[PDB]
Design an enzyme around this catalytic site. Structure first.
Site, mmCIF file in Angstrom:
data_model
loop_
_atom_site.group_PDB
_atom_site.id
_atom_site.type_symbol
_atom_site.label_atom_id
_atom_site.label_comp_id
_atom_site.label_asym_id
_atom_site.label_seq_id
_atom_site.Cartn_x
_atom_site.Cartn_y
_atom_site.Cartn_z
ATOM 1 C CG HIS A 50 -3.898 5.004 -0.668
ATOM 2 N ND1 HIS A 50 -3.665 4.400 -1.719
ATOM 3 C CD2 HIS A 50 -3.367 4.695 0.608
ATOM 4 C CE1 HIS A 50 -2.733 3.549 -1.164
ATOM 5 N NE2 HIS A 50 -2.554 3.802 -0.075
ATOM 6 N N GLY A 102 1.898 -1.668 -4.001
ATOM 7 C CA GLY A 102 1.150 -2.580 -3.696
ATOM 8 C C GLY A 102 1.313 -3.248 -2.557
ATOM 9 C CB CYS A 121 -1.242 0.291 0.545
ATOM 10 S SG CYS A 121 0.025 1.592 0.006
#
Ligand SMILES: [Cl-]
Lengths: 305, 305
Positions: free
Chosen positions: B41, B143, B145
């Site tokens: 993503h 942030g 991920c």
């Protein structure tokens, strides 16, 4: 979201973990530039520890009696010296991985991270706090001496602890990296007394401030209080007296949440008096005082070291 | 002595933490040899996340649209591919610090360590567990991920997790390093359902076994039980059913302590029925199920990785 007991990234301190062996006793060391810092009771025997004369014992030791190995490489120990309750062993080489560092004597109540080590080999990391009685409740087995505590600020590793002994209470004691023991403790296997510990109030209020940021808001009340009335409830429950400096330190958090410090003190006051009632705040059925207001701003800010 | 929530030494995984940026969205990556693994993503915009067609979105992206930087050095992305819910970005270079590693899909109930990272920069480490409902209760902000979970066995880093999203419940979900989501979760900002979690029984019995080793012995009782009667108390309290394999796994601990598993199950049975009575076991006023029987043998054995 979420508030967990976080610990600083251990890589920088891992490179400095070595092994120092004098006689049969083998403990860990910390190799920064051309010095290997290790606890001084490496020179004691099995019958020296109740009351060792560290001076005379060391006078019998030479450089070649100390066997430092940074993993598989062995270091030629070219000098030996005693600073307080530690041994400083000069060596022919400088650790290629020496982090930018500073030695620091932290104040009671401030938190740091322990890299528990055995035979110079890092095992794992966790966040401990210097209790008001200069003890730390950690996880140490025989062979963990030398495991250093530390903080990391941007790029500097500020070493602040070195584990030395386990007290009768089950908690542990250590020194700074100059050898001066935190607390009233001496490196001798004697029955020592850890004072009546207290509860870090500025840190319970900061962990409650965290819960509000992360959803847990049931403790928040309509009541209020005075700084002296919460200090009268505090003294009853053997909590640390709160000062105006605590209020100013908890200010940045109090603004991000819009709740006044003394208001949160009423919610605290009322958790001590009426307990927890089986509920949980941020996943604990007790009150947590091992998070300094910086640990709360840091985890709720996404800081990177 | 002492039992604390320990986490594996993070150094080996720190070297592999990089930063991947596609468009405005910037997340973390993991650089092992000539591939940079990051959540997929990263290619979504602000209006793509409710239901992204990841195929078409990626078909518009090329290699030069991905901007990988391992700190200050930038990596020439020479290939891009999608495996399940992750992006695998071939690069001209191999991480000089690539640890010996293995990708693993851990089973529900097994524990690992998270190196929570932001913008490719390690921030701190803590031990999380894959819950029975394939969720993890950790500490993640926007942030985070790409922050990978992992275990370390002797010398091998067995990566097992990558944080992808925060669920409405407040817990978090991720994938293995092949991209297959742990649980029923899909990478799309939708209201997803974390199932009725259960309590890892083999892990509460192992943390109780730890308390006995570390002094807390008040829960130990004179009663006993059957494996099926503790499973009837278990089902009431939404605990995980206990099998004979759990009993055999808890055997090594049961021998070091001399207490039978089913006896400890009676002490457990009686903590669930009559609660904790305000007492604390190993420092918690609740029952802890985030320690697998290996985490208990490991911390009470002084293992080194
Ligand atoms: Cl608790």
């Amino acid at each position: 979201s979420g508030f967990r007991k976080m610990a600083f990234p251990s890589g920088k301190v891992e490179g400095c973990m070595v092994q120092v062996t004098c006689g049969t006793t083998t403990l860990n060391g910390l190799w920064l530039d051309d010095v290997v810092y290790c606890p001084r009771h490496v020179i004691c025997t099995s019958e020296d520890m109740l009351n060792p004369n560290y001076e005379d014992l060391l006078i019998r030791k030479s450089n070649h009696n100390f066997l430092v190995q940074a993993g598989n490489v062995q270091l030629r120990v070219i000098g030996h010296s005693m600073q307080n309750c530690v041994l400083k062993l000069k060596v022919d080489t400088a650790n290629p991985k020496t982090p930018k560092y500073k030695f620091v004597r932290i104040q009671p109540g401030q938190t740091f991270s322990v890299l528990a080590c055995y035979n110079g080999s890092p095992s794992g990391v966790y966040q401990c706090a210097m209790r008001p009685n200069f003890t730390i409740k950690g996880s140490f087995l025989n062979g963990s001496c030398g495991s250093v505590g530390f903080n990391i600020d941007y790029d500097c590793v500020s070493f602040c602890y070195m584990h030395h002994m386990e007290l009768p209470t089950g908690v542990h004691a250590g020194t700074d990296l100059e050898g001066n023991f935190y607390g009233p403790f001496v490196d001798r296997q004697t029955a020592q007394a850890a004072g009546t510990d207290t509860t870090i109030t500025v840190n319970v209020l900061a962990w409650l401030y965290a819960a509000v940021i992360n959803g847990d808001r049931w403790f928040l009340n309509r009541f209020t209080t005075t700084l002296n009335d919460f200090n009268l409830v505090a003294m009853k429950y053997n909590y640390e007296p709160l000062t105006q400096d605590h209020v100013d330190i908890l200010g940045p958090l109090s603004a991000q949440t819009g709740i006044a410090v003394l208001d949160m003190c009423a919610s605290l006051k009322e958790l001590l008096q009426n307990g927890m009632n089986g509920r949980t705040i941020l996943g604990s059925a007790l009150l947590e005082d091992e998070f300094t207001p910086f640990d709360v701003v840091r985890q709720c800010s996404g800081v990177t070291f």
